[PDB]
Design a protein around this ligand. Structure first.
Ligand SMILES: [Mg+2]
Ligand SMILES: [Mg+2]
Ligand SMILES: [Mg+2]
Ligand SMILES: [Mg+2]
Ligand SMILES: [Mg+2]
Ligand SMILES: [Mg+2]
Ligand SMILES: [Mg+2]
Ligand SMILES: [Mg+2]
Lengths: 216, 225, 109, 4, 39
RNA sequence: GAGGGAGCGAGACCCGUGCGCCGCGCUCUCCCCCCUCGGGGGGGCCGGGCCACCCCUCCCACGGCGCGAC
RNA sequence: GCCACGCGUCCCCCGCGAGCGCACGGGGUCGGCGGCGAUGUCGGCUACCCACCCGACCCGUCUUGA
RNA sequence: AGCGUCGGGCCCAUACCCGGCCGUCGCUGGCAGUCGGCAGAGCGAGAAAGAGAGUGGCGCGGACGCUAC
């Protein structure tokens, strides 16, 4: 009986401890820690009592079966995967939402979700763009951040919230979420000059402009 | 019964477990002792120099025990007196490699084929890279990969050669059992040289690659591996 | 509401003097003339467009005549801003000296 | 047995 | 590598602590240089 | 991204489960304490050589100098 | 900093403790997704025609040599 | 864009390397062990050989397989 302690030796690099096993015998304190040494169910009848069986063998077999498969070891599934993120994208940064029907628009980042997709909100007031998911890989990072730290955005919104079902009508709750985040942010973006113009404006290339060459 | 037998079978597995552990700890201690060995070997060759210059004399170091040979040109139209030698050194394919202990007997053959090879004195790291990455033993006439020590213990247990490390030790220190250690090793299938070659045809001194280029072989290995 | 892709020309296939290995293709991108410069474009999704007689489907819309062959910018080629690229199906030689739309959206930033 |  | 040669744990566990300590000394010398010119 | 029956366990007082060999190593079966907000993260828990600083001087190796001997 | 730790006995000097998780570990999996569609659309290598780029001297034979 | 002396960089052959697939050769390799309420499912492991006899001190269950030209 004992609550589980953390790993005693720290991680320097993946799979290598800081300490040696001989200092570890001591730190664990092994000097004072040596050791030595259903399927059948009974049922009543209105006869006698019948001893029935659970999980009886199948009534039909197929003509031929495929064999067993080997045990691969390192292949965890997607839910359990770790989710990476680029250094550029911190909450506040402005993104260029390149691909969707909302093409080339300039939009503020809120949060990475568990899935790893980005929470984006081009203010519905301004852009006519709600709370929408996107993927990182299809998105440019501008260097124009803002101090968004102080708002308590709700927990309830999430991946399964945005997951498709199988006509689409806009929910009142959706309207509340939009309105609730707006009332919080909108003064910070209207405080900085011309930025609301910039956001209404859309990004787009033109003659003699080469991404590799220019910098932003 | 299947009672006494179960308990006995458990003791047998437990014994073989403790045995495998003990071989592991033994392996560890050989390797650390060799690290101490190599460090000593490297410092003393300098110490001899510093003290020699202090006195005003010159320290001539020892001749090199070992050479790493490479065949650089192909299979078409080659003198038969060459071909015999080449196939005695086991250089059947191009960009094949072999180790060779030195002496008058070997060096005169390498003179006789100077134009076809590139040899020199290889360093310790180059020996590690070659053995570890591309080690394949000749076991029962079959090119099998050096992935566990068991594959070595079965064959070379009689020379107290139980691991990659002991093997290395014999190679660098051209010990007693070189013949067996090298004949165990399959000719090294090295790739084409990254970066390129200067000029295949001519000798190094006249700006080529053939012949003795003592140390620069390491640079060449790093470009070929 | 504007040009969302960089221009490239299909100069030719990978080839020696008397043999061309047409599974690979050579691009000559506009305004890029060094191997330093070509490090940006790595990984990007190219897209050869074309139009044909009969009506075909169009994702998110009614059926258009236009069609496409998607591709991918493999690695740099040469020292003067040419670039290798491998398309999913092999390219027709008709297209020599024409436009391909390299997109942006596998960003490497 | 010494481990015991 | 350990399955073949287990001592690599100690050989690659050291040559890290060494480098971090030596990096500390490089920075200590730079700050002491500012102390020497300023003082 | 070829390959596809590796078995673990419990034992003749049972009849299961399919995460299994080799290899690295975390916690509990000791006891206390500490920190961030019941959960999460830490310090550790005592013995012994070795080398660490300073005083002495033994054995071997190699080099130099000096006296002496053949 | 150490792959150093019962007691008793031997030398030189002072053969069965169990339990639980992690993984750069004896050859890839998702317990992750999205679009199109019943009269003009999807697939259809080969086999029908045409186009383009590169490659390319008409067979058999005697012959040192076609 | 000639001549002589040289640097880095760079270009591709059915050659070289890593991987996939076909056939042949060699290992005169492995497999008759599908031994099931007469059952207990192993014999790839660094080291000539035995899961060897004895004698004193409820529920009825367990895939494929092998034309051995
Ligand atoms: Mg190159
Ligand atoms: Mg031609
Ligand atoms: Mg059009
Ligand atoms: Mg004729
Ligand atoms: Mg003829
Ligand atoms: Mg004639
Ligand atoms: Mg080829
Ligand atoms: Mg091969």
């Amino acid at each position: 009986k004992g609550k589980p302690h953390c790993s005693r030796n720290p991680v320097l690099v993946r799979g290598i401890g800081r300490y040696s096993r001989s200092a570890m015998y001591s730190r664990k304190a092994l000097y004072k820690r040596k050791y030595a040494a259903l399927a059948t169910v009974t049922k009543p009848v209105g006869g006698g009592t019948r001893v029935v069986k659970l999980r009886k063998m199948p009534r039909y077999y197929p003509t031929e079966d495929v064999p067993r498969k080997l045990l691969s070891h390192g292949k965890k599934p997607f839910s359990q995967h770790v989710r990476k993120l680029r250094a550029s994208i911190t909450p506040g940064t402005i993104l260029i939402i390149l691909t969707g029907r909302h093409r080339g628009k300039r939009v503020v980042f809120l949060k990475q979700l568990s899935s790893g997709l980005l929470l984006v909100t081009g203010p519905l007031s301004l852009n006519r763009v709600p709370l929408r998911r996107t993927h990182q890989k299809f998105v440019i990072a501008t260097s124009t951040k803002i101090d968004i730290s102080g708002v308590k955005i709700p927990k309830h919104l999430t991946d399964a919230y945005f997951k498709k079902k199988k006509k689409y009508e806009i929910t009142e709750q959706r309207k509340v979420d939009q309105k609730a985040v707006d009332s919080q942010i909108l003064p910070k973006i209207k405080a900085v000059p011309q930025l609301q113009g910039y956001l209404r404006s859309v990004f787009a290339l033109t003659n003699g402009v080469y991404p590799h060459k220019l910098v932003f | 019964n299947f009672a006494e037998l179960k308990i006995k079978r458990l003791r047998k597995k437990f014994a073989q477990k403790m045995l495998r552990k003990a071989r592991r700890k033994l392996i560890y201690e050989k390797a650390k002792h060799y690290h101490k060995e190599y460090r000593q070997m490297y410092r003393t060759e300098i110490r001899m120099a510093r003290m020699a210059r202090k006195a005003g004399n010159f320290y001539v170091p020892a001749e090199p025990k070992l050479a790493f040979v490479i065949r650089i040109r192909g299979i078409n139209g080659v003198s038969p007196k060459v071909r015999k030698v080449l196939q005695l050194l086991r250089l059947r394919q191009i960009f094949n490699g072999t180790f060779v202990k030195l002496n008058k007997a070997s060096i005169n053959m390498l003179r006789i084929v100077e134009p076809y090879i590139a040899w020199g004195y290889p360093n310790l790291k180059s020996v590690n890279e070659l053995i570890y990455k591309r080690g394949y033993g000749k076991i029962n006439k079959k090119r099998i990969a050096l992935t566990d020590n068991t594959l070595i213990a079965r064959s070379l247990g009689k020379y107290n050669i139980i691991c990659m490390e002991d093997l290395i030790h014999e190679i660098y220190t051209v010990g007693k059992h070189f013949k067996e250690a090298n004949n165990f090793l399959w000719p090294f299938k090295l790739s084409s040289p990254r970066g390129g070659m200067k000029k295949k045809t001519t000798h190094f001194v006249e700006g080529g690659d053939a012949g003795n280029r003592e140390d620069q072989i390491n640079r060449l290995i790093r470009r070929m591996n | 509401s504007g040009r969302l892709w960089c221009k490239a020309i299909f100069a030719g296939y990978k080839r020696g003097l008397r043999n061309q290995r047409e599974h690979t293709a050579l691009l000559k991108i506009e305004g890029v003339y060094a191997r330093d410069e070509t490090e940006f474009y790595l990984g990007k999704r190219c897209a050869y467009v074309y139009k044909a007689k009969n009506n075909t489907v169009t994702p998110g819309g009614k059926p258009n005549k236009t069609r496409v062959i998607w591709g991918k910018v493999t690695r740099a080629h040469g020292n003067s801003g040419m670039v290798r690229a491998k398309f999913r199906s092999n390219l027709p030689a008709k297209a020599i000296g024409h436009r391909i739309r390299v997109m942006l959206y596998p960003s490497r930033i | 047995r010494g481990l015991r | 590598m350990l399955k073949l040669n287990p001592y690599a744990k100690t050989m690659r566990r050291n040559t890290i602590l060494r480098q971090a300590r030596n990096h500390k000394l490089r920075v200590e010398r730079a700050a002491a240089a500012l102390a020497a010119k300023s003082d």
